[PDB]
């Protein structure tokens, strides 16, 4: 009775839970873009691994349609969790402030059916709210473009724990 | 209890893992300076700082700056500017000032002389924290000739000396 | 009382066994490109972090030869990493599963002897396998070119505890 998550029993002693140090999980759901007037959505499945205070979302490859300069794009965490995970254990530790985390390049595709141009955008995590994750894309400049090829992406971030 | 060590702590009258090396925010307000071959310039950033477990996030956002060389350095002067209670200790590696490859990534740096960026492709790393001054190096990617650069948000992460 | 790494006996309390909270090493050691039929190794020195249930392998900057528009970057764990370290400490989480972790754009410079052009092609885990660690470097488009300048790249992936 005296030990308290991530503390646990462990063959007879006193250990870290294995669940704390890694769980995998998935996401089936859809992606959302947002953008000046441009609005899009596709679905994905992606992989997810809870390891210590991080859950980490594996975005697969995927295409879309045009983007603008900057835009939101959104992961609807409100459905598609593979079982046992719920919505509620894809809050960041920060909750929903608005930040700017976890900052990085990708690298999209834009095309209109020919060779795609790819544009250096910069990709954070902004806000978490009800269940939506919102990833701010902007930056990099742009071209005239019908679709965009988005490359794999990793989206990681501290989870609650209370 | 004074049986338990840090991490290691008492939650709700059990043995459980102390919530602040679970997560601990706070916030810089201070000075990110540029220099490489004869170019120095700096300017003041806002950047929220998250500790999880063994790691340091600091969630530097966008900037602007003037002209950058193909190699040089982004220093982050820590002595000055942290949130209490954090000091400039606190963001000392865990490699404390060993010279490092570390968290090597891409970072896109749109240059320009007042009109439309050109983005380079280039490398940054944590390369030394010395004396509360934490040393990035940013090189690769080619240049061109150029008076302003737009510096993407860029997160620097490295485990935290304990 | 019984305790189970990486619950340890730390100054006569319950606490964090410090080796579970940082460790340095290194691998020095054998990098292969495989795709398309272009096979070739490079030699590296590469710092090796683990950090909690994490491993982080710092890889320098080094050049090659041509590319394929997708291919394998595979990391020979078998020799080269520093004592006390084995082969098995590189395992990951995931053990042998395919996975499309930690994608990141990665920027190459493709040349044949003159002035690189700098191709974003995609990067991530995708299969360790009896200590050799594959890594899928994809997309980004091509050019012709008989050399290439690879970025340092650090990789990283939750470690096996089993
Ligand atoms: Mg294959």
Same mark, same amino acid.
């Given at each position: 009775p005296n030990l308290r998550y991530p503390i646990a029993d462990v063959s007879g002693g006193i250990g870290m839970s294995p669940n704390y140090r890694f769980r995998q999980s998935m996401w089936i759901g859809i992606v959302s873009y947002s953008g000046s007037g441009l609005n899009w959505r596709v679905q994905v499945n992606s992989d997810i691994f809870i390891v210590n205070d991080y859950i980490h979302i594996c975005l697969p490859a995927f295409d879309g349609f045009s983007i603008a300069d900057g835009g939101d794009l959104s992961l609807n965490?409100? #459905? $598609?969790?593979? +079982? +046992?995970?719920? #919505? $509620?254990? #894809?809050? +960041?530790?920060?909750?929903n402030d608005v930040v700017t985390y976890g900052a990085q390049t990708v690298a999209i595709g834009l095309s209109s059916g020919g060779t795609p141009q790819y544009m250096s955008k910069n990709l954070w995590v902004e806000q978490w709210q009800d269940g939506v994750l919102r990833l701010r894309v902007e930056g990099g400049g742009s071209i005239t473009h019908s679709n965009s090829k988005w490359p794999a992406m990793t989206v990681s971030y501290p989870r609650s724990f209370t």
């Amino acid at each position: 009775p005296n030990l308290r998550y991530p503390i646990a029993d462990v063959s007879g002693g006193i250990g870290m839970s294995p669940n704390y140090r890694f769980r995998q999980s998935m996401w089936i759901g859809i992606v959302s873009y947002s953008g000046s007037g441009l609005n899009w959505r596709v679905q994905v499945n992606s992989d997810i691994f809870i390891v210590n205070d991080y859950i980490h979302i594996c975005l697969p490859a995927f295409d879309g349609f045009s983007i603008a300069d900057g835009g939101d794009l959104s992961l609807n965490f409100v #459905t $598609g969790l593979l +079982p +046992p995970l719920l #919505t $509620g254990d #894809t809050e +960041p530790a920060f909750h929903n402030d608005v930040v700017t985390y976890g900052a990085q390049t990708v690298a999209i595709g834009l095309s209109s059916g020919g060779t795609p141009q790819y544009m250096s955008k910069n990709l954070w995590v902004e806000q978490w709210q009800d269940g939506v994750l919102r990833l701010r894309v902007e930056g990099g400049g742009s071209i005239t473009h019908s679709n965009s090829k988005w490359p794999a992406m990793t989206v990681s971030y501290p989870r609650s724990f209370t």
